[PDB]
Amino acid sequence: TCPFYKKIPGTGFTVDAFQYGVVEGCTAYFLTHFHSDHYAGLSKHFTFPVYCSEITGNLLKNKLHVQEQYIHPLPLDTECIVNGVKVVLLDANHCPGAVMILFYLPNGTVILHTGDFRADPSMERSLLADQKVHMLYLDTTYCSPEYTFPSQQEVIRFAINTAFEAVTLNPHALVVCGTYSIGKEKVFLAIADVLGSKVGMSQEKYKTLQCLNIPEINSLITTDMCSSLVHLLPMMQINFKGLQSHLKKCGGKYNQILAFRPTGWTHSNKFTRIADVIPQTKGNISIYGIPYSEHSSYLEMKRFVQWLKPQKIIPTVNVGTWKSRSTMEKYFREWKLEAGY
Ligand code: NI
């Protein structure tokens, strides 16, 4: 059964609710982004209307084989009418094609559902600037002050400088980057750009990337592993055994691997600056964990919410435990008292 925090009151609508069967009274299913915990349940046999971004709709059709007649792509930043209700899709600053959804209820209530997002001050000048929001369905992934991490720009600066130094010292070094979903494409694209290479990857991952409307993509990626010195592998293979095995397959072209694991937050963030990050090394293999986040830090979340001043907040992440729920409710009240709404 579909939980209450995936239902939009006063509508026929659900958000990211595809794993519950036919939801009673749902006339349109929204999908915020193509991440498996959110799309869980979709396939070529789905026969209800799905509303989403153009990019999410390319992935639905090509990767999950959802039939074209049930995919309803909407442009961003544009007022649209869906089953009698005005909606707008906004960029969520998460993975490619990820949106927030503004719903204008027939009774005058305005609801924002963030999906998954990384809050940014640039959002304070979207179509959100122009009216009041009553209810906020909020991505609370890192809703605690211990969650700190650097900007995405600082993390990419580290990665590009680290890769360029290594390969210039040793032209026979291979760079490998881990992946298990869409998102974080800048990590491997920025490294391949500084090295003058395309990124080599499997047919299945190449297919996924070709659905993303990234400019000049045919210029940046390839399935010819032999022509590339930046390789993508599944995240599960980014360990000493997995990388040793990959190095064997390269036919003595390379004698060293430098590998990156883009994670979210890890506890080494509470002690170390990005500048000071060091790898794990074994022999000719080094592995860097880099804190490239596509979710709001605590401070970014707090700033967004204090700017928006919602009347009610409904968390969509960490909702399974009473300790988590109580923690989050405490911070929401602090924020409200400090800002005065
Ligand atoms: Ni996500």
- What is the distance in A from the centroid of ligand 1 to the CA of 167? 33
Tell me the C-alpha distance between 39 and 32, whole Å. Answer: 9
Q: Is 110:311 a contact under the CB 8 Å cutoff?
A: no
- For residue 212, the one-letter residue type is L
Tell me the C-alpha distance between 56 and 109, whole Å. Answer: 27
- What is the distance in A from the centroid of ligand 1 to the CA of 57? 16
- What is the distance in A from the centroid of ligand 1 to the CA of 35? 5
3-state secondary structure labels for all residues of the chain: CCCHHHEECCCCEEECCCCCCCCCCCCEEECCCCCHHHHCCCCCCCCCCEEECHHHHHHHHHHCCCCHHHEEECCCCCCEEECCEEEEEEECCCCCCCEEEEEECCCCCEEEECCCCCCCHHHHHCHHHHCCCCEEEECCCCCCCCCCCCCHHHHHHHHHHHHHHHHHHCCCEEEEEEECCCCCHHHHHHHHHHHCCCEECCHHHHHHHHCCCCCCHHHCEECCHHHCCEEEEEHHHCCHHHHHHHHHHCCCCCCEEEEEEECCCCHHHHCCCHHHCCCEEECCEEEEEECCCCCCCHHHHHHHHHHHCCCEEEECCCCCCHHHHHHHHHHHHHHHHHHCC
- What is the distance in A from the centroid of ligand 1 to the CA of 63? 17
- What is the distance in A from the centroid of ligand 1 to the CA of 340? 32
Tell me the C-alpha distance between 224 and 232, whole Å. Answer: 12
Identify the CATH class of 148-295: alpha beta
Tell me the C-alpha distance between 66 and 47, whole Å. Answer: 9
CA distances from 298 to 119, 244, 295 (A): 10, 38, 9
Of 339, 282, 278, the C-alpha closest to 305 is 339
- What is the distance in A from the centroid of ligand 1 to the CA of 225? 29
Q: Is 119:303 a contact under the CB 8 Å cutoff?
A: yes
Q: Is 66:44 a contact under the CB 8 Å cutoff?
A: yes
Q: Is 114:69 a contact under the CB 8 Å cutoff?
A: no
Of 3, 218, 232, 42, the C-alpha closest to 56 is 42
- What is the distance in A from the centroid of ligand 1 to the CA of 33? 7
- What is the distance in A from the centroid of ligand 1 to the CA of 234? 17
- What is the distance in A from the centroid of ligand 1 to the CA of 182? 9
Q: Name the β-bridge partners of 111.
A: 103, 135
- What is the distance in A from the centroid of ligand 1 to the CA of 116? 5
- What is the distance in A from the centroid of ligand 1 to the CA of 232? 20
- What is the distance in A from the centroid of ligand 1 to the CA of 300? 17
Q: Which two tokens stand for residue 14?
A: 């659900």
Tell me the C-alpha distance between 316 and 26, whole Å. Answer: 19
Tell me the C-alpha distance between 135 and 133, whole Å. Answer: 6
Q: Is 204:59 a contact under the CB 8 Å cutoff?
A: no
Q: Is 227:237 a contact under the CB 8 Å cutoff?
A: no
- What is the distance in A from the centroid of ligand 1 to the CA of 39? 10
- Cα 155 to chain center, whole Å? 16
Q: Is 201:260 a contact under the CB 8 Å cutoff?
A: no
- What is the distance in A from the centroid of ligand 1 to the CA of 81? 26
Q: Is 4:24 a contact under the CB 8 Å cutoff?
A: no
Tell me the C-alpha distance between 170 and 240, whole Å. Answer: 20
- What is the distance in A from the centroid of ligand 1 to the CA of 47? 24
Q: Which residues in 1-27 are b (16+ Cβ under 10 Å) and which e? A: ebeebbbbeebbbbbbbbeeeebeebe
Q: Name the β-bridge partners of 174.
A: 257
**Which residue has tokens 């049930």?**
70
Q: Is 202:210 a contact under the CB 8 Å cutoff?
A: no
CA angle (331, 118, 203) in 5-degree steps? 140
- What is the distance in A from the centroid of ligand 1 to the CA of 140? 12
Length of the chain: 341
Sheet of strand 312-315, all strands in order from the earlier edge strand to the far edge? 80-82, 85-91, 99-104, 110-113, 135-138, 312-315
- What is the distance in A from the centroid of ligand 1 to the CA of 172? 36
CA distances from 246 to 113, 221, 253 (A): 42, 19, 12
According to the CATH classification, is domain 1-147+296-341 in 3.60.15.10? yes
Q: Is 275:161 a contact under the CB 8 Å cutoff?
A: no
Considering the chain, tell me which residue range(s) the CATH 3.40.50.12650 domain(s) occupy.
148-295
- What is the distance in A from the centroid of ligand 1 to the CA of 231? 24
Tell me the C-alpha distance between 36 and 159, whole Å. Answer: 27
- Give, as residue ranges, everything with CB less than 5 Å from ion ligand 1: 35, 116
Tell me the C-alpha distance between 140 and 148, whole Å. Answer: 14
Pairing of strands 221-222, 173-179: unpaired
- What is the distance in A from the centroid of ligand 1 to the CA of 259? 23
Q: Is 270:297 a contact under the CB 8 Å cutoff?
A: no
Q: Is 220:198 a contact under the CB 8 Å cutoff?
A: yes
Of 79, 141, 140, 139, the C-alpha closest to 110 is 79
Tell me the C-alpha distance between 76 and 216, whole Å. Answer: 21
Handedness of CA 304, 306, 309, 313 (dihedral sign): positive
- What is the distance in A from the centroid of ligand 1 to the CA of 256? 33
Q: Name the β-bridge partners of 85.
A: 82
- What is the distance in A from the centroid of ligand 1 to the CA of 137? 15
Q: Is 50:35 a contact under the CB 8 Å cutoff?
A: no
- What is the distance in A from the centroid of ligand 1 to the CA of 115? 8
- What is the distance in A from the centroid of ligand 1 to the CA of 295? 8
Tell me the C-alpha distance between 102 and 135, whole Å. Answer: 10
Burial class (CB in 10 A: 0-12, 13-18, 19+), 294: buried
Considering the chain, tell me which residue range(s) the CATH 3.60.15.10 domain(s) occupy.
1-147+296-341
